[PDB]
């Protein structure tokens, strides 16, 4: 029974309870350490050295475990809450209900990118931006400002059709599914969404925006969809690769979990809908 639901489908009660649980993690001091951990891996993961959270095959299991840690923290506040996901190929405009004042609030105003509505607007006093590099302390967004369009379903399908999970050199130059989903090569899925939201979502402290979790919950769903399309293909590499997390190697910062432990999401949650394998 943990079911991760498309954001577009949440009831008003589910939106209220998700927002309240996120705001309580922020109030209690727990939220900001997720932002810090993410920025430390963003700044440390490099194409020519050790790389774990990003630009590497473990991008997908790493974010799956990071999102599980966050969802478990939300459930410690309200056990009914699960992470929703944002299908940005379907819900692709600023008028999507995701961006309404009863959910995440909308785009930032034109002068300073400040978000002016919703529960995370700085004027509420409930969403200080603490872990930061740009010194301003208010949530900012510029939806569609730095890149015109979110990816489309056709572009997503072109990436889901790639049969190799990843390929040497296992970094931002790779061909293969992982790097096309991450977006450093090709039509660009995940990186482009960060750029399209703008504000803190365009930076290494991107978890400052609660939409981070919904974006990564949909990236995580696309990994599950890829597995259903390619039940014969699996995580690589499978042993002895310097600087890259192999299938059965443990992953920082937890050190107690491996990609192998995270491949099957159903050990932890299911989705509202996930196509079964077919032709």
């Amino acid at each position: 029974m943990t079911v991760r639901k498309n954001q577009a489908t949440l009831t008003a009660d589910e939106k209220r309870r998700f927002v309240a649980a996120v705001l309580e993690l922020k109030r209690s001091g727990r939220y900001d350490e997720f932002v810090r951990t993410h920025n430390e891996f963003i700044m440390s993961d490099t194409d020519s050295g050790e790389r774990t959270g990003h630009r590497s095959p473990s991008f997908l299991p790493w974010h799956r475990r990071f999102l599980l840690d966050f969802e478990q923290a939300l459930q410690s506040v309200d056990s009914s809450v699960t992470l929703p996901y944002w299908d940005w190929s379907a819900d692709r405009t600023v008028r999507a209900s995701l961006w309404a004042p009863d959910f995440l609030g909308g785009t930032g105003r034109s002068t300073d990118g400040r978000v002016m509505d919703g529960p995370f607007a700085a004027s509420t006093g409930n969403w200080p931006i603490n872990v930061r590099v740009d010194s301003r302390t208010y949530l900012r967004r510029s939806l569609g400002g730095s890149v015109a369009e979110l990816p489309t379903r056709a572009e997503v399908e072109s990436v889901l059709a790639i049969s190799a999970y990843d390929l040497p050199p296992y970094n931002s130059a790779s061909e293969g599914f992982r790097n096309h989903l991450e977006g450093w090569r090709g039509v660009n899925l995940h990186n482009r969404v960060h750029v399209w939201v703008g504000g803190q979502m365009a930076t290494g402290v991107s978890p400052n925006d609660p939409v981070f979790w919904l974006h990564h919950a949909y990236v995580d769903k696309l990994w599950a969809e890829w597995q259903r399309r390619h039940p014969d293909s699996a995580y690589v590499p499978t042993g002895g690769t310097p600087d890259v997390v192999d299938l059965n190697e443990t992953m920082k910062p937890w050190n107690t979990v491996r990609p192998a432990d995270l491949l099957d999401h159903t050990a932890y949650y299911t989705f509202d809908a996930l196509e079964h394998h077919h032709h």
């Binding site: 194409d47 990118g113 990186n191 365009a202």
Partner: protein, 78 residues
């Protein structure tokens, strides 16, 4: 081989670059004397921590993208 150094005033901010919790790095950028984390990608493009997901061709381009992002605000050190 490292990019060349640079020094200019861009949009009223002093930006400097030079060959040299985060990756032990080969090039340094500063915005009004505050160091900005930057990184080079395998294809030779660059990013910074305030524009991480949007590669640009050079460290000066990353520094200029950071000044654009900041909209006049001070950078905090990393």
């Amino acid at each position: 081989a490292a990019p060349e150094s640079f020094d200019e005033v861009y949009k009223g901010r002093r930006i400097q670059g030079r060959p040299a919790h985060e990756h032990g790095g080969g090039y340094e950028v500063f915005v009004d004397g505050v160091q900005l984390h930057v990184m080079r990608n395998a294809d030779g493009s660059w990013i910074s921590v305030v524009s991480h997901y949007d590669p640009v061709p050079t460290p000066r381009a990353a520094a200029r993208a950071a000044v654009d992002e900041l909209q006049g605000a001070p950078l905090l050190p990393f």
